Design a protein around this ligand. Structure first.
Ligand SMILES: OC[C@H]1O[C@@H](O[C@H]2[C@H](O)[C@@H](O)[C@@H](O)O[C@@H]2CO)[C@H](O)[C@@H](O)[C@@H]1O
Ligand SMILES: OC[C@H]1O[C@@H](O[C@H]2[C@H](O)[C@@H](O)[C@H](O)O[C@@H]2CO)[C@H](O)[C@@H](O)[C@@H]1O
Ligand code: BGC
Length: 358
């Protein structure tokens, strides 16, 4: 609609991903592939605040973006992921985090938010777009029978609400994570999802800064598939555009003219999964459609790269306390390192298989 957060701004490139990509490119032995790989650092991505250790990094990004805007004549936009809930990743094992409910988890989380707000407050000339807590709300829609999720429900809702309420006070544009077509896009899940997202939006005061929802984060779905991926059998909403087209009117009828962003960073190669629920380090994935506000849909503000391709989805080591057997399936690249850490061989394949090519 009228106010697309990306209009009129230059996106500040992630220095964190740039550091990973530059080091990765120097280890890619074929020169042509290496130069393609290095160019990935010039593609805008979201930087994840997956621990309190990343908050000072945010400060450096905001200050660097502010200075760059001054010296290039532009207004700069910093893209972040808020990803540190207590009892994080409640329906899987791979991305358990540093906060736990019993260890002052909710209070520590809200202070994590306070530290982030305190950084953002110092740089009002820099726009921030934040994806709020990948997987969390989607787990509350469909996984309430998972006892870790059920026992985390009040903490998740309180923490997400605190993030939305307080990031809005410093003008952060926000997209709540909303799973993907194979998670919440099933027709049967659309209304339960809309009802929960509506309640969350209402609880945070319907802030104009809460733009809508993010989809496909860290997943592999097409935005628009000419033919359904065979894994989608039984779900007419076989790609993200079908999911968004079906969900958005429900939000509108609840009063929220929500818009969307869609991760395509690992979506260049379709039809490569055995089963739709295979989310971990899918082999043969390629970088997908480059970020753009030319989205092909009234509901979609931007195609984005949220998950930084090359950072692992999870370890394949069953000796790890974060081992999830999804990461050992036949379509998962193995051996794979701990979630979030660099997976060089996987990055090289993402480069080689990029569609459109790099
Ligand atoms: O999409 C990335 C996240 O997937 C989560 O699992 C989902 C899965 O994507 C769906 O396809 C379906 O199988 O339901 C699952 C939830 O039970 C996973 O838990 C997360 O760790 C991933 O980040
Ligand atoms: O489950 C009831 C639901 O089925 C829908 O059709 C299914 C069909 O049963 C299945 O064989 C096929 O693989 O997927 C389609 C959906 O894409 C039917 O359209 C619904 O009316 C019905 O509620
Ligand atoms: O790579 C982006 C994010 O992916 C998640 O799966 C990891 O748990 C995070 O540590 C990381 O920040």
């Amino acid at each position: 609609s009228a106010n697309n957060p990306w209009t009129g701004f230059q996106i500040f490139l992630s220095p964190y991903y740039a550091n990973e990509v530059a080091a990765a490119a120097k280890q890619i032995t074929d020169p042509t592939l290496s130069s393609k790989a290095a160019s990935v650092a010039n593609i805008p991505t979201f930087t994840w605040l997956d621990s309190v250790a990343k908050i000072p990094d945010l400060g450096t990004y905001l200050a660097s973006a502010s200075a760059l805007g001054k010296s290039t004549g532009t207004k700069q936009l910093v893209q972040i992921v808020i990803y540190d809930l207590p009892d994080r990743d409640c329906a899987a094992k791979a991305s358990n985090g540093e906060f736990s409910i019993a260890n002052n988890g909710q209070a520590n989380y809200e202070n994590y938010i306070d530290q982030i707000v305190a950084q953002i407050q110092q740089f009002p000339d820099v726009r921030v777009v934040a994806v709020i807590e990948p997987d969390s709300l989607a787990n509350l829609v469909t996984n309430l029978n998972v006892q870790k999720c059920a026992n985390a429900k009040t903490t998740y809702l309180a923490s997400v609400n605190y993030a939305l309420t307080n990031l809005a006070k410093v003008g952060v544009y926000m997209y709540m994570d909303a799973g993907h077509a194979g998670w919440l896009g099933w027709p049967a899940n659309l209304s339960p999802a809309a009802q929960l997202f509506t309640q969350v939006w209402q609880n945070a005061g319907k802030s104009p800064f809460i733009k809508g929802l993010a989809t496909n984060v860290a997943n592999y779905n097409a935005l628009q598939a000419a033919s359904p991926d065979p894994i989608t059998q039984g779900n007419p909403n076989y790609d993200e555009i079908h999911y968004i087209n079906a969900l958005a009117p429900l939000l509108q009828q609840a009063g929220w003219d929500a818009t969307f962003i869609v991760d395509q960073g690992k979506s260049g190669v379709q039809n490569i999964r055995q089963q739709w629920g295979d989310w971990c380090n899918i082999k043969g994935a390629g970088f997908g459609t480059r970020p753009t506000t030319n989205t092909g849909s009234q509901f979609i503000d931007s195609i984005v790269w949220v998950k930084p391709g090359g950072e692992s989805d999870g370890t394949s080591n069953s000796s790890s306390p974060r081992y999830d057997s999804t990461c050992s399936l036949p379509d998962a690249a193995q051996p794979a390192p701990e979630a979030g850490t660099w997976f060089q061989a996987y990055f090289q394949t993402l480069v080689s298989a990029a569609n459109p090519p790099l």
